[PDB]
């Protein structure tokens, strides 16, 4: 039943007595449900250390992964180029999923096509699909360039992307001079960030490998910036803003910021902004190339150092205070441009916020997960705040990255209770936050179930989630935030301290029970 003046959505509509009775009748009569005592005892068991030991013995089953597959990152990389259509050679369901994932994170249209490879292609290969798809995509969406990646089906059957595109050009399906860079992006290797790396290396190779004769390092007086897999528009914006304030000529390669943030003015813009083909062609002439997320830009680093002959600096992701300082100082040294007074003042303002919030930040225990570079930058910043990361999870991390993060943790007294986990999922992390409870989690939307589970154990066992990372589906417009530089550090600090203060306010809101500590001033 519904009152027209106070219409109820599913919650709390299904909490009404009649719906509760109906659901109880369904469960009792036909669901053959386990008794509630059995369910409670099994849940309690899943929160224990013995269950954690069984859980960490897993070698074939993955539960609630913290990663995606390569073509997702390939598509995100392709989106950052001007009038470029991401093109995944393979099966259409993958493209539907990629578009949905990015739509839900960005709340924007996401352009990507497939050549709809099917059983017929599963036998004979995907060459005809490639020819037809390139022709139709160019004719229909009129892109300047088509960036080709693959789904796992095309990788398994071993479709030759180079040969397929060359045959499409030779047979007239697409103009011979039309740019069709490609990358093999197998989903059974690495993760989405590996796909981003592979796609970027493919595009850079396509536009520069054969025309290195006339290239001179430093002749265009610019610094190439490769952002990697990045889902905060504010990070692209802050990098561009800081380089502009410094007076440093730069070339942001793969800039998807505009196309993921088009205005609502009654017109649909398929393409907006993006790195131009001239920029990528001219990239070897840059002074140097800076990789913002080096731990998943290794293939790109190898190509840039070996072919462009750029001395790519050993730089961490510009996250937190020290690493933003190091990034700025390296850029200053490369470009010869001094760090200006505005950036010095911004750094001082971040330090001022740190001093204002240190008492509430100090000693707070965090579980956290995400991509390798983001996770390590967050760990570094948390150490800078006097916080204690305890459970550091990177599902798509590797041994070398774990060793680097362990070195970071050893450099700080605040990392002494921290463990780094690679190849572990969010079910592992659920066990960890039950058995060694942190104060907060930091991660993407998938953490909300863990928090739910912890709350089932008890309000005193609940671990609140702080949403930083990708994807964020259950909040709006957080993709507009910044995590890089002093601005990103300021935003992260504000989020952390105010999450702590909101949790404290909730814990002390009980009239005549805990509200003696419900202070007006914090």
């Amino acid at each position: 039943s519904q009152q027209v003046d106070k219409i109820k959505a599913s919650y709390p509509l299904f909490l009404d007595q009649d719906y509760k009775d109906m659901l109880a009748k369904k469960r009792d009569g036909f669901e053959e449900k386990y008794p509630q005592d059995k369910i409670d005892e099994v849940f309690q068991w899943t929160t224990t250390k013995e269950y954690q030991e069984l859980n960490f013995q897993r070698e074939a089953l993955t539960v609630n992964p913290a990663k995606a597959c390569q073509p997702l990152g390939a598509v995100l990389c392709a989106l950052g180029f001007e009038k470029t259509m991401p093109y995944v050679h393979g099966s259409q369901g993958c493209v539907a999923y990629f578009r949905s994932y990015f739509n839900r994170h960005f709340r924007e249209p996401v352009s990507c096509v497939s050549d709809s490879m099917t059983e017929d292609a599963a036998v004979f290969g995907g060459q005809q699909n490639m020819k037809d798809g390139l022709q139709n995509c160019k004719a229909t969406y009129k892109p300047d360039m088509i960036a080709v990646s693959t789904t796992c089906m095309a990788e398994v059957i071993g479709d030759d992307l180079n040969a397929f595109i060359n045959n499409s050009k030779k047979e007239g399906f697409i103009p011979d001079e039309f740019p069709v860079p490609f990358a093999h992006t197998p989903s059974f290797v690495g993760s989405h960030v590996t796909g981003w790396d592979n796609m970027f290396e493919g595009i850079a190779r396509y536009f520069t490998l054969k025309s290195m004769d006339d290239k001179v390092v430093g002749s265009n007086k610019k610094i190439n910036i490769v952002p990697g897999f990045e889902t905060y528009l504010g990070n692209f914006r802050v990098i561009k803003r800081m380089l502009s304030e410094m007076g440093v000529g730069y070339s942001l390669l793969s800039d998807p910021e505009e196309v993921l943030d088009t205005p609502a003015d009654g017109q649909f813009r398929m393409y907006a902004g993006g790195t131009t083909q001239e920029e990528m062609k001219d990239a070897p002439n840059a002074l140097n190339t800076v990789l913002l997320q080096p731990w998943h830009l290794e293939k790109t680093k190898k190509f840039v150092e070996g072919t462009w002959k750029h001395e790519v600096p050993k730089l961490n992701i510009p996250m937190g205070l020290d690493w933003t300082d190091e990034f700025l100082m390296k850029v200053s040294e490369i470009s010869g441009q001094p760090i200006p007074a505005s950036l010095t003042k911004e750094r001082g303002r971040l330090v001022d916020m740190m001093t204002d919030s240190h008492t509430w930040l100090h000693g707070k225990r965090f579980a956290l997960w995400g991509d390798p570079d983001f996770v390590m930058g967050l760990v570094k910043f948390l150490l800078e705040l006097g916080c204690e990361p305890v459970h550091i999870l990177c599902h798509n991390g590797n041994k070398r990255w774990k060793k680097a993060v362990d070195a970071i943790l050893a450099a700080s007294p605040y990392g002494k209770n921290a463990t780094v986990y690679i190849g572990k999922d969010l079910w592992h992390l659920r066990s960890l936050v039950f058995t060694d409870k942190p104060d907060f989690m930091i991660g993407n939307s998938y953490g909300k179930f863990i928090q739910r589970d912890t709350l089932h154990k008890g309000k005193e066992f609940e671990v609140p989630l702080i949403r930083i990372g990708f994807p964020i589906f259950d909040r709006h417009h957080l993709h507009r935030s910044t995590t890089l530089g002093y601005e990103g550090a300021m935003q992260i600090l504000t989020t952390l301290v105010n999450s702590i203060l909101e949790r404290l306010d909730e814990e002390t809101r009980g009239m005549q029970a805990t509200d003696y500590n419900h202070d007006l001033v914090r």
């Binding site: 449900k33 597959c69 259409q92 709809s116 099917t118 160019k138 089906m153 609502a264």
Partner: protein, 383 residues
């Protein structure tokens, strides 16, 4: 599909894991293959259910074999067997496992059927291998067919020789309702108020035992015939169970469907149907009186018409000529052109939309979307 063109069309895996098998709460569904498909489909559909997630229900979870290169090169059958053992260890209260094949399973020669049979015999468990590799077929429709075939072959006839279930003449089964935002619950309350016993309801909020009990019902009420027409015809042929389509979208469709369903039973059921219609008439009438003035005359670009006409909205069937107030038939592309896009089930954020309770929510959402001031702010005053 036509290569090189954008579409939101899913694959067979999206039709089998996403639509048919995934909503079954007390089962564990393994996305067999690389990590992508299970992650993108994880909790992506609002198939509502009641349970303790991770203990006796597993819908919003992502179980996967996370295929690596060595799994591709040497096969994943041993990995699948070890995974089933680990599933048994870490989730002892699961009532069955399904193995939803992703694309590479169909191309590397893996035999999930033999593994399913051996492990299911060993553990005395129902392990359902589904060959729903995404490259099969052109959409999710073939995936629906494959998932329905798996239901028939491995689950549906499990109680063929059992006779211990106490049947009543008022036994119905709700098939093909995926309980999007609780739609199936909103239908089930009306059916039970009619005096019917909903013995089986799947996939939405569905349990494996309910699927097994479906062959014991007197009537099969099918909501989504598109995905669940193979199984309904199979049940009619084998068990002699008649099936009919129902439509609870809007008061007119709901009342007609309730009368049609009650016409299949005795006079007591018809009397209760009349009582239910009488009980709910003032509520949907109040909804109409409140929201039809705010929506009368607005055009919808298009199980389709009913609720829209109950609110006085004209339905139509290039977009700059019709000038539609709303598209019912790519949400963000339409949104960028200043046209709201909405659907029949509240896929994204809201619901239920079915039944009398869902009609109020649907009318409120229609008014909120169509009359929101944001749609009138596309042109800057200086442009």
């Amino acid at each position: 599909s036509q290569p090189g063109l954008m579409t939101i069309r899913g694959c067979a895996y999206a039709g089998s894991k996403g639509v048919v098998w995934g909503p079954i709460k007390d089962m564990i569904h393994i996305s067999h293959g690389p990590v992508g498909c299970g992650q993108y489909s994880r909790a992506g559909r609002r198939n509502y259910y009641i349970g303790t997630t991770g203990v006796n229900a597993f819908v919003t979870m992502n179980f996967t074999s996370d295929f690596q290169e060595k799994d591709i090169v040497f096969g994943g059958d041993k990995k699948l067997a070890k995974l089933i053992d680990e599933v048994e260890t870490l989730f002892p209260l699961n009532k069955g496992i399904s193995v939803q094949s992703e694309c590479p399973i169909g191309l590397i020669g893996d035999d999930i059927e033999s593994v399913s049979k051996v492990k299911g015999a060993e553990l005395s468990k129902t392990i359902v291998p589904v060959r729903c590799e995404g490259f099969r077929g052109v959409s999710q429709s073939l995936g629906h067919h494959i998932a329905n075939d798996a239901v028939r072959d491995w689950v549906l006839g499990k109680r063929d020789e059992d006779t211990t279930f106490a049947s009543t003449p008022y036994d119905v089964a709700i098939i093909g309702d995926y309980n999007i935002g609780g739609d199936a619950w909103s239908s089930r309350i009306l059916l039970e108020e009619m005096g019917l016993r909903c013995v089986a309801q799947w996939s939405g909020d569905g349990s494996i035992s309910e699927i097994e009990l479906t062959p014991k019902v007197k009537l099969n009420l099918v909501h989504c015939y598109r995905s669940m027409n193979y199984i309904s015809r199979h049940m009619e042929e084998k068990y002699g169970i008649p099936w009919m389509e129902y439509n609870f979208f809007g008061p007119t469709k709901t009342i007609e469907s309730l009368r049609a369903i009650a016409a299949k039973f005795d006079e007591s059921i018809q009397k209760k149907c009349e009582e239910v219609i009488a009980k709910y008439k003032p509520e949907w009438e109040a909804v109409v009186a409140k929201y039809r003035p705010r929506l009368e005359g607005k055009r919808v670009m298009l199980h389709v018409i009913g609720a829209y006409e109950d609110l006085g909205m004209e339905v139509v069937g290039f977009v700059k000529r019709i000038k539609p107030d709303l598209i019912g038939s790519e949400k963000f592309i339409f949104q960028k052109m200043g046209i709201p896009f909405r659907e029949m089930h509240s896929w994204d954020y809201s619901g239920p939309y079915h039944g009398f309770d869902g009609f109020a929510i649907f009318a409120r959402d229609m008014d909120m979307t169509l009359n929101n001031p944001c749609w009138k702010k596309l042109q800057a005053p200086w442009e």
